[PDB]
Design a protein around this ligand. Sequence first.
Ligand SMILES: [Cl-]
Ligand code: NA
Length: 297
Amino acid sequence: MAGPEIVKLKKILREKAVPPGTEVPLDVMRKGMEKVAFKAADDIQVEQVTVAGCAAEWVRAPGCQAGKAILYLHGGGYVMGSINTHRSMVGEISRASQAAALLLDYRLAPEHPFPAAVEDGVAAYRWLLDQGFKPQHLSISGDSAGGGLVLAVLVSARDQGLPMPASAIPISPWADMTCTNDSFKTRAEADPMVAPGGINKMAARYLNGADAKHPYASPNFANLKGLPPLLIHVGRDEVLLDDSIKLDAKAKADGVKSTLEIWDDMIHVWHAFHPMLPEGKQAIVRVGEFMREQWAA
Ligand SMILES: [Cl-]
Ligand code: NA
């Protein structure tokens, strides 16, 4: 059934998880995420750059093809996460796709609420086009809050007249700020991650009074017509299951070439656990293949 890695991983995550209900201050969560972040592989080279007023890093694994790039939007519920927390996983995505990744330190809430993150994402994409990268040589990817942001950035870029990239790969996307999908109940017991009444708090902090059904905050409610080919990754054992299934339905309905992959026994952004999780490495390899596939077309 389930690999021994995932089983032990779920065990470890449940042991370290903070009890439901307990309110962890934001700076504490932010420092905790930074503290436990995985160190990127020794062969991942990095270059600090500033993009659209944001700190960023070009994350290049060996084997990167010149002319191609990935705009990567990190997870962290729009309130935490950074270049440092995602450098390891992004390095591996760069390895599998044979393309350098632009890891953006976009503005976070509550200091900079919605639509600050979307503006930064769109500006970073504009920046890439301005640097000379061709739309057909580009890809946008991100996890969790970052996965939703991938879609939000695409819709906003499109509305502003920007060309669409060759592909987009949202990982465990959070594309519905309302958090009302059934999976928050049907997949809760199997989701070792936290938890959430904790997730409603992040939505509150990000929106800061904005309509939770705003297209740029919750892409599952947006018009996705014209968006590029999509690869949607999501674990069957996560509370955001329904977000990915509904995103896929919305996309196909809007004429978008969408490919949803629900990985059995997997958890929220299981990719991040590639060091100890075979499925993690596998999923990342798949993201890379899909990106290469779309760039070849
Ligand atoms: Cl923001
Ligand atoms: Na198909």
